[PDB]
Amino acid sequence: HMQTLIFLDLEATGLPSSRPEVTELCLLAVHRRALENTSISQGHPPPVPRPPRVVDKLSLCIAPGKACSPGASEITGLSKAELEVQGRQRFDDNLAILLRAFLQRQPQPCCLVAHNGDRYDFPLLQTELARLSTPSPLDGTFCVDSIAALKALEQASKSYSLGSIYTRLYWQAPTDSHTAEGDVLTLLSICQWKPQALLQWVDEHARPFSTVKPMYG
């Protein structure tokens, strides 16, 4: 039984072929009680659920070592030059120390939830952490891809991009697409669609983050 779900989103300099680097990271830590007490979804469509009162949130912009592709910069609204002029620092040991302290405030066991995590966010995060001297702060942490989760939840009762799912469930467009915090809030909203069912799915398919292979070396 996971006690904490940590909704995660990364934005980066480009697509996996590009050997991308992280430009923004958001973590939203929600205790399982706070999630499973999100009210049922009635109506077609139901209203967009309200986030739980009690949450822990960390959102950071990160200077990459290489430029964002024009396309990445258009959709994320971020660029290496603007990140550097505002003094953003690299993905370095102090950041790992920060994440470690943030994670240690969460009850265990703890599971990251990210949309397309299995093929982007998690392997990329593994790569950024591998470059550090610091031992990984995520080794004891679990992770799941919300795509597989929502596929299993919908067929228990067609695109699976974040926006497609949110639109299909609430008949509205998400807000603040491809911003780390905005995407995390959209994912939380989707996961509050059937919190108990999702939580049971997570408990069954969560896997240790230490088993995730890096995106590149």
Place this chain on the structure above:
Amino acid sequence: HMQTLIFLDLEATGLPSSRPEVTELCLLAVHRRALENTSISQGHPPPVPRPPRVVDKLSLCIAPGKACSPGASEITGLSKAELEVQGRQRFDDNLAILLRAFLQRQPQPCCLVAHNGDRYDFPLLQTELARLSTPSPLDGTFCVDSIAALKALEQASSPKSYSLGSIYTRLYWQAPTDSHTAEGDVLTLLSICQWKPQALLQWVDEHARPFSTVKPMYG
């Protein structure tokens, strides 16, 4: 010249008389360039500005050592019982580590900005940090009270309540959202501080004082 403004709000178990303890804390770190490149406020009323794209955010719920007053739990929507059952940790050394590493990512010098901060947020934070073995992570950090800031700005602008909501409604003709939540109040404060960013930064540089000179509320 302050290079980073860190908008800060604390919620707690009650008023200073009751020797309160922190229950929620939000920091919103904004580089000075992101603030002064906010679109110039025009129109009457102007729209509530968008937050700058580039920000660092940290919001945390904290288990207090004492229960909240009836009123405090009502306005904040928090209670010691609910924070505990959701596993929230107390104001401890690990939190001080988190704060230290967060501040270290911001360009220096860095200034805290909190509404009524001189009479509540800053002295209470100093009291919480003083209970810890850890040397204060705020020793090299500055702080200002946005009440003084907004008063000074409106006195120069125009040769009356200064509560957060009264200012926000006067500037924008709408009520704030999510009052007495840590992140909600920080977002409200940022919006009123984006009213006149250049003049605000000028006032902050003139009046930023070391957090080390802040007297603890109690203890």
